[PDB]
Structure of Integrin alpha-IIb:
Amino acid sequence: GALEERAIPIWWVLVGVLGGLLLLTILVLAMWKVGFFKRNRP
């Protein structure tokens, strides 16, 4: 009810967000490196 450890792991939430952000950033930067966000298609 309160004592219980929902843990409302604000930290894990913060971690998840930061992590999701890092993953998005890396995928984004990587995709940018490989040119995927890029077109220059024929």
Observations:
- The two ends are 61 Å apart (CA to CA).
- Helices lie at 10-33.
